[PDB]
Structure formats: structure tokens, C-alpha cells
Design a binder for this molecule. Structure first.
Ligand SMILES: NC(=O)c1ccc[n+]([C@@H]2O[C@H](COP(=O)([O-])OP(=O)(O)OC[C@H]3O[C@@H](n4cnc5c(N)ncnc54)[C@H](OP(=O)(O)O)[C@@H]3O)[C@@H](O)[C@H]2O)c1
Ligand SMILES: NC(=O)c1ccc[n+]([C@@H]2O[C@H](COP(=O)([O-])OP(=O)(O)OC[C@H]3O[C@@H](n4cnc5c(N)ncnc54)[C@H](OP(=O)(O)O)[C@@H]3O)[C@@H](O)[C@H]2O)c1
Lengths: 284, 284
């Protein structure tokens, strides 16, 4: 019995589709905040349960009798609130007698300068307190954050504008990260282990721009700018202030080597990784 | 304005008595679960407020307008519950706009084999997420845990019985640890810093027994035993099972070097440390 929180979200939806290739739908439980959004899952053989991280009682019920739990992190912007939610989740899983928990954390968190990394470490320590056999799935930033349909704005202008400088990026796709979680949940050998699930073929924004140029046939350059120019760029392109700030801070951190370390853990878990060109062409 | 949680507890009571030597009672707020227990504090000039870690709303009210908060950890035996409580506390302090927070953690936590160390690390990361200027007061085990009026049972029998083997102990008194917290709250220079507040004159249970012999005039030896012999010893001396287990696990960890690392941080903060003989004679 494998339960997946965040099941209607992007990552959780992909996990379930990967689990559906490995186990009967019978064994999969989707735990979800909005039960009406989960109908398509229930049309597949997947059991749907209500579980809201803000409501301990819902989590008690949702985790009842689950063997393996994949706890996908909350997306909230308030990190201090996210620590409460995650704590509620961990306490509910302990009380429910969950037998194995996997948690989607953040690669190389101890060296991060992004405050969200402190949430993932707080949560990993919270899970260690339960004594439940664990797998810490320490996910890179998503390649999809940087490479998406929004790249058409850059083809248009001839420029990818960021404040990442020549920082290196070890991102991987949500889909490879979903496969990794599904792999771990469906095979032995991953108990009490941490994996830093990142690329071993990192890239730069110069390189991304050369790739976009090759694919589109149109000349695009990386235009690196300052933090304040980025946030301005973003706000004036219709990106709401808090998210524009979040985004500039992620690029700023990249410029300082936040995403520059690599591991073979993911490749060892899922096999060959998707080349960035292949992801760029899909995005377009 | 300096607020102290756990104010009717042993450590918090001593902190307030130390703060009373440094600031008018006007500026001190005792935050407390049981308001009737705090009357003696209110007879001094100290403001009493209700704050229960299980009740977010109480904490919102209790932390209103406080400048500096000393968050003394919860004593609960359920570590997973303690993570929820501590998270509630941290979120309340962020919401209340607390300007500086000190938290009593556990020295060298990253190297601990005691599960309570994961709670203190989860909490430190929770505090880092708030961005509030912090002081992590990483307290050694209390010398008072080992050296107390209970040593008369050992004088009686001629033996201190433990499963600590010849493990080394860097413990310090609750009172020195209270002085350290009070010092930090009342002088500049301690913002965004962690201190491992332990002894630089560690001791063994052989040594404790020689000291008890010198003080009492009666011959007492350390009798080191196994984990299961300890727990049995303890249970049959009227120590309730969960606490007997807690105690055997603390000694077991000592036997494996849990308390063997030292730092000059405390001595640098408070001046000379209390010799163990002086603490033994007080206990008796
Ligand atoms: N590594 C990265 O680059 C990266 C980037 C962004 C996010 N993340 C983290 O990884 C997680 C998964 O990524 P994603 O792309 O799948 O994000 P996503 O599409 O935003 O999914 C977030 C999921 O969490 C659910 N959720 C929100 N609040 C909840 C609550 N109170 N109780 C229960 N569920 C709640 C959402 O439910 P609804 O559908 O009902 O709203 C949604 O299913 C995110 O939650 C976030 O913490 C990582
Ligand atoms: N370093 C060590 O060797 C060591 C040893 C033991 C404990 N500790 C930790 O350090 C802390 C202080 O040590 P201590 O000797 O002063 O312990 P203590 O005498 O047991 O004090 C614990 C304090 O926390 C309060 N408390 C319990 N539950 C609470 C709640 N739900 N909301 C608000 N307050 C609550 C208690 O209030 P009441 O008086 O109303 O019950 C008490 O004032 C402990 O909480 C524990 O986590 C450290």
C-alpha cells in the first residue's frame, strides 16, 4: 500500500503515473486536499483520500493503514508556516503507524543559501525523530522552472534575461524526479538512505541560450542582469511581486554556486538522464 | 523587554533570578503554562503571561510586543509531539514580530545518538527560517541529572550503579546554564551565534565516586553494568519504565562518547565553572 501526498500537484501526478506502470492501481492511495480535483485519478483504479496539512485530524484518517508514504513537500510561500504543516504531517504518519516514509527534500541543503532549504532540513530531522525507516529524496531544482513554454518570450526578444550570471545549474526534470520517487517506493534497498537527485551534466544560461538558438533557429543570447534589474524585468512582465522576488533570489543563489554540485545518485537510480536539448524542444 | 518561556520550570526560574540581578523586574515577562504556579514571580516585579505550546492562540497573545525571547525547550517525552510544539512556538514568535530569539538546544547535536538531539536541530532550523536574529544556546546535559540528593542511595550501598562504563561527561549545572542564557539576553555581541555550553573539565563516573567518597567519608565505587541491568536496577528502585529507559539510554550514549567533547564557550561567557566537588557537597 503506497500513499502519495500532493497527488493532484505536478510532481505527485507524475509519481502516480509512474507507480501505475509498476503496481496495480489497487495499492495506490492519492492523498489530496481537494477531492473533486482527484476524479481523473479515481477513474484510474486509484483510491482517493482527503488529507490537508493544516488539519491534523484529516491526516490521521488519510494515513490510516498505509504502509509506505511519499510525503511531497508543501508549496506554501510562508516557510515558517510550512514547518508547522510538515510537522503535522510527520506527527500524523508516526501516529498512523506508517511503515516507511519518503520525503522530497532539497539536494545539498546544508550548503544552501535559500531559506526553503532550512524547511527541508527541519522536516528531515522531524522524520528522524519518528524512527520510521526513511528515504530522503533530495530533489534538485526543477529543469522545468527554467525551461518551459515561457521560453517563447525569449525567442521573441532574442534574449534570456536572468540574474544567474554564469552560475552552473544541476537541475533535473520533474519527470525524472517522479520516476526516482516511484522507483524507490517499489524496490528494496532504499531504507534509511539520502540521495541527492541532481544532474551530472550541469549546464549554464549561456548554454541554454545556444540550445534555444539551435532548436528555434532564431538567435538568442543570455543577458545576465543584476538582482534589481531581474525583479523589475519580472514585475513588468506580469509576474506578481512575491514570486518575482522568489525567482530573482533563486537566480542570485545560482550565481553564487547554489546549484553547482553534482552526484551520480539519480543516474544510478533511474538510468540515463534527459538531455537538456530534448527538454527544450518539448517546452517549445 | 525580555520574555522567558518555561518560567516556572527549573532552568527558567533560575534564568529569571539571574535576569533580576541585571535588569528591573519591569522588563521581564514570565511565559508560563500554569498561571497559579507563577504567583511567587508576580510577587517579584515580573509580568506573568499565559502561554501553552499546544495552543497557538495563547502564544500569539503571550509574545505580543516582546523584544527578546528565550525559548526554553519543552520537557515532553514524545519527541515527535515536541517538534509540533516547538514549531508552534517558532511560528508564534515570527507572527508576533519577536526581535531576537534564544533557544536552549543541545551541545554537539549533529554528532548525537540521542533522538532528542534531532528535535533540537529541527527547532534550530525552524528558527533559521524566521530570519529573526538568533542565539543557539546549546546546553550540555545537566550535572544535576547525575549529581543530586539521590546520591544518598549510593552512599548507603557503597556504589554508584550506571551503564555509562568509563564514558566521559562534559555536563554543567542548570545554574551556570541559566547564567549563560541571562548573560546572552542582557549584552550585545551574541546575535546570530551558536555556543556549545559544556565543561572543559570533564569527568568520569569513577571520578564522581572518588569525589562522593571524599565528601561523605564513606567508600563508594562506580559499579558499571549493562543496559538491561541498569533499566532493571532503575525499575526496581521505583523509577517508572519510560524514565528508566530514558536514563539507561543516556548512560549508554555516554559510554559511547556522547558527552566527551568540550568547548571553552561557556567559560568564556560566564567565567570560572563550578568544580564537581562543590556540586557534590551541595547535593548532599
Ligand atoms: N525542486 C524544485 O524546483 C521545486 C520547485 C517548486 C516546488 N517544489 C516543492 O516540491 C513540491 C512538489 O512540486 P510540484 O511541481 O508538484 O508543485 P505543485 O504542482 O504546486 O504541487 C503542490 C501540491 O501540494 C498540494 N498542497 C498545497 N497545500 C496543501 C495542503 N494544505 N494540504 C495538502 N496538500 C497541499 C497542492 O494541492 P492542490 O492541487 O489542491 O492545490 C498540490 O497538489 C512542492 O510542494 C514544493 O514544496 C520544488
Ligand atoms: N540539558 C539537559 O540535561 C536537560 C535535561 C532535562 C531537560 N532538558 C530540557 O531543557 C528544558 C528546561 O530544563 P528544566 O530542568 O528547567 O526542565 P523542567 O523543570 O521540567 O521545566 C520544563 C518547563 O516547561 C514547561 N512546559 C511543559 N509543557 C509546556 C507547555 N505545553 N507549554 C508551556 N510550557 C510547558 C513546564 O511547565 P509546568 O511547570 O507548568 O509543568 C516547565 O516550566 C526542558 O524543557 C527540557 O527540554 C534538558
Amino acid at each position: 500500500s503506497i500513499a502519495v501526498t500532493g497527488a493532484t500537484g505536478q510532481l505527485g501526478g507524475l509519481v502516480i503515473q509512474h507507480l501505475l506502470k509498476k503496481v496495480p492501481a489497487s495499492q495506490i492511495i492519492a492523498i489530496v486536499r481537494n477531492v473533486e480535483k482527484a476524479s481523473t485519478l479515481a477513474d484510474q483504479g486509484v483510491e482517493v483520500r482527503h488529507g490537508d496539512y493544516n488539519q491534523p485530524e484529516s491526516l490521521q484518517k488519510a494515513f490510516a493503514g498505509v504502509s509506505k508514504l511519499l510525503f511531497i513537500s508543501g508549496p506554501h510561500y510562508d516557510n515558517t508556516l510550512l514547518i508547522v504543516q510538515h510537522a503535522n504531517v510527520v506527527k500524523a504518519a508516526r501516529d498512523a503507524g506508517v511503515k516507511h516514509i519518503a520525503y522530497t527534500g532539497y539536494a545539498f541543503a546544508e550548503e544552501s543559501i535559500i531559506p526553503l532549504a532550512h524547511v527541508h532540513l527541519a522536516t528531515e530531522y522531524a522524520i528522524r525523530t519518528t524512527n520510521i525507516p526513511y528515504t530522503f529524496l533530495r530533489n534538485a531544482l526543477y529543469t522545468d522552472f527554467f525551461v518551459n513554454e515561457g521560453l517563447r518570450a525569449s525567442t521573441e526578444s532574442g534574449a534570456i534575461v536572468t540574474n544567474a550570471g554564469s552560475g552552473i545549474v544541476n537541475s533535473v526534470t520533474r519527470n525524472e524526479l517522479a520516476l526516482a520517487a516511484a522507483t524507490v517506493l517499489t524496490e528494496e534497498g532504499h531504507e534509511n538512505k539520502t540521495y541527492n537527485l541532481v544532474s551530472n551534466q550541469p549546464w549554464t544560461f549561456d548554454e541554454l541560450a545556444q540550445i534555444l538558438s539551435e532548436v528555434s533557429g532564431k538567435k538568442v543570447v543570455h543577458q545576465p542582469v543584476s538582482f534589481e534589474e531581474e525583479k523589475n524585468f519580472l514585475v513588468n512582465a506580469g509576474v506578481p511581486e512575491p514570486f518575482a522576488e522568489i525567482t530573482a533570489a533563486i537566480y542570485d543563489a545560482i550565481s553564487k554556486g547554489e546549484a553547482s554540485k553534482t552526484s551520480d545518485d539519480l543516474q544510478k537510480l533511474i538510468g540515463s538522464l534527459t538531455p537538456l536539448k530534448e527538454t527544450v524542444k518539448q517546452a517549445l
